[PDB]
Amino acid sequence: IVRPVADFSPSLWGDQFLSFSIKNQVAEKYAKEIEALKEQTRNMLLATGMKLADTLNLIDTIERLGISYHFEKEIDDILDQIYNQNSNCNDLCTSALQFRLLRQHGFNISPEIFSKFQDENGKFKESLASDVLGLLNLYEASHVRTHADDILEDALAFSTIHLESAAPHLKSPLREQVTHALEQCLHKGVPRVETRFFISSIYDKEQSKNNVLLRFAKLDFNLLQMLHKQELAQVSRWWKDLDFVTTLPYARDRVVECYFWALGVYFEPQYSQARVMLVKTISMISIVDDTFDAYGTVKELEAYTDAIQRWDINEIDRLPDYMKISYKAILDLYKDYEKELSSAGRSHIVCHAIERMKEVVRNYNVESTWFIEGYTPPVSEYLSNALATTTYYYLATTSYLGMKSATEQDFEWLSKNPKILEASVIICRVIDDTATYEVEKSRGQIATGIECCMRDYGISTKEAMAKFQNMAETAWKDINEGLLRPTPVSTEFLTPILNLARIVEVTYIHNLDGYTHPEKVLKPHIINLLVDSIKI
Numbered sequence: 001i002v003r004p005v006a007d008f009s010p011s012l013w014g015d016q017f018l019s020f021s022i023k024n025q026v027a028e029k030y031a032k033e034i035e036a037l038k039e040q041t042r043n044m045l046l047a048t049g050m051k052l053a054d055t056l057n058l059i060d061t062i063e064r065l066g067i068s069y070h071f072e073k074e075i076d077d078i079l080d081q082i083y084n085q086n087s088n089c090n091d092l093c094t095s096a097l098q099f100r101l102l103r104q105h106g107f108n109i110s111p112e113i114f115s116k117f118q119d120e121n122g123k124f125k126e127s128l129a130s131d132v133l134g135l136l137n138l139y140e141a142s143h144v145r146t147h148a149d150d151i152l153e154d155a156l157a158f159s160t161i162h163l164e165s166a167a168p169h170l171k172s173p174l175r176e177q178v179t180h181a182l183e184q185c186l187h188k189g190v191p192r193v194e195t196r197f198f199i200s201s202i203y204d205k206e207q208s209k210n211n212v213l214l215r216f217a218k219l220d221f222n223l224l225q226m227l228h229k230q231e232l233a234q235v236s237r238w239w240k241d242l243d244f245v246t247t248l249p250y251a252r253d254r255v256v257e258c259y260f261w262a263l264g265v266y267f268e269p270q271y272s273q274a275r276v277m278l279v280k281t282i283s284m285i286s287i288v289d290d291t292f293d294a295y296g297t298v299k300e301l302e303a304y305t306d307a308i309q310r311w312d313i314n315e316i317d318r319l320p321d322y323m324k325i326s327y328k329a330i331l332d333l334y335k336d337y338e339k340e341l342s343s344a345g346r347s348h349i350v351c352h353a354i355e356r357m358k359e360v361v362r363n364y365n366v367e368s369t370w371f372i373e374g375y376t377p378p379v380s381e382y383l384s385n386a387l388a389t390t391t392y393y394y395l396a397t398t399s400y401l402g403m404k405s406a407t408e409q410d411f412e413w414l415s416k417n418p419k420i421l422e423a424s425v426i427i428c429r430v431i432d433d434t435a436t437y438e439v440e441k442s443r444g445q446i447a448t449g450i451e452c453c454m455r456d457y458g459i460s461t462k463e464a465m466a467k468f469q470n471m472a473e474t475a476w477k478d479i480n481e482g483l484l485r486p487t488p489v490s491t492e493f494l495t496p497i498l499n500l501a502r503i504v505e506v507t508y509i510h511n512l513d514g515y516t517h518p519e520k521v522l523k524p525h526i527i528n529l530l531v532d533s534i535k536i
């Protein structure tokens with residue numbers, strides 16, 4: 001009664017990440033210079049009597065350079081001031097940038113700021129088609145819409161067609177920046193990824209660049225990268241001493257991709273413990289998913305699911321030997337988390353992630369039951385099960401474990417499935433179903449999202465993929481709305497959820513599974529963030 005056949009590609013990284021020894025004198029030299037550069041930058045920000053457009057461009061540059069996390073208080077104070085002054089007297093470039101920066105920071109600036117750029121019908125004035133910097137900022141702003149912003153319904157299409165038309169004749173690096181924006185907008189990109197591109201491909205090549213900011217940005221990126229590499233080494237060593245590579249050979253060996261995921265959720269040094277905890281969880285639920293999907297028999301998956309609900313080491317012997325391996329590793333991981341959080345008296349919060357894991361596994365087992373039965377549920381029923389199998393309710397909960405400022409009330413909010421979390425989960429689900437529809441269908445999975453959608457509504461695969469694309473668009477508007485003040489918890493606890501949605505977009509770009517097939521999408525990102533330093 002043997003098993004399915006292995007068709008997963010092995011880790012393409014080998015052991016190149018296993019040991020990283022930080023050049024300590026370089027670290028100290030970088031940090032010492034950064035302190036000086038950080039103060040110079042702080043004073044640029046606090047400079048009295050700057051014009052609106054100059055201020056917004058400064059803040060935008062500091063944000064794209066990846067160093068704004070040093071200046072949360074200064075940037076906030078400035079945007080707040082701009083928000084409350086109501087300055088509606090500018091051109092498209094400044095207005096669109098004003099709108100984007102304020103919305104991204106939760107300031108509900110009215111979309112009426114764009115009325116002066118439109119005709120009697122709410123269509124942008126085509127006379128603006130020759131203003132490339134205006135179009136570019138309009139373009140970026142168009143991705144931050146909520147449901148109250150139908151004034152902007154035309155902004156994406158308008159700016160896109162005219163940027164495409166202008167791009168081939170633009171000077172550099174402007175051309176490269178426009179071309180990049182059309183493939184990957186800023187708001188929906190992974191921050192370290194956009195930062196790496198901006199620093200190296202754009203700002204470094206700008207004639208007008210500020211030398212202080214550029215040097216700051218390069219040193220800071222390379223210094224954080226040393227931390228990230230230590231973290232990945234520590235995590236690679238943990239994964240190695242688990243040895244699932246050989247004892248659980250049916251499973252995807254993707255701990256580096258998992259680290260990239262955790263790095264997407266937060267890159268700052270204060271979230272180091274959080275990242276390390278998170279990547280371990282992603283790594284481990286990856287193992288569980290492959291057990292349900294590519295190895296376990298329905299009888300085996302039943303006992304596994306029940307063992308997880310009971311969550312007791314007593315239960316191991318009801319499981320086949322190969323499931324004993326992962327089950328003990330799972331239980332041990334949570335005992336590790338409890339020990340890690342003990343000194344800060346935050347051990348009790350681990351139970352929130354545990355309950356969310358039980359939920360994921362219940363729904364894995366349902367999904368397997370559906371496959372065995374040849375069942376094509378209605379879309380509503382399909383989603384009631386398949387949203388949790390994204391693991392995103394679970395990963396979001398997990399992202400909070402290592403965040404020292406997360407309180408019980410923050411977990412209570414998250415446990416009620418707030419709308420911002422639900423939208424992030426929906427984006428993951430529908431993008432995944434759109435990308436992986438064809439392959440899963442060939443493997444016989446009749447319970448696949450798009451199939452459900454086709455059979456339920458009586459519509460073609462094309463119309464179904466388009467209906468899913470639209471649920472993703474609706475979900476982004478809900479994310480954007482969920483960031484607006486007053487927020488139900490600190491922005492600190494919203495950003496991970498937003499970042500989870502961004503990682504989806506980036507991994508499944510151009511409709512391909514970038515996690516199962518890392519070489520396409522993830523590999524260049526991993527090399528740019530974790531292998532190659534920015535040349536100084």
Ligand SMILES: C=C(C)[C@H]1C/C=C(\C)CC/C=C(\C)CC1
Nearest residue numbers: 282285286289390391428432515
């Ligand atoms: C649905 C998505 C995008 C998941 C699929 C991947 C797994 C279940 C393995 C670990 C979980 C990850 C990488 C989140 C993505």
Ligand SMILES: [Mg+2]
Nearest residue numbers: 289290292293
């Ligand atoms: Mg699966």
Ligand SMILES: [Mg+2]
Nearest residue numbers: 289290293294
């Ligand atoms: Mg799977």
Ligand SMILES: [Mg+2]
Nearest residue numbers: 432433436440
């Ligand atoms: Mg899938």
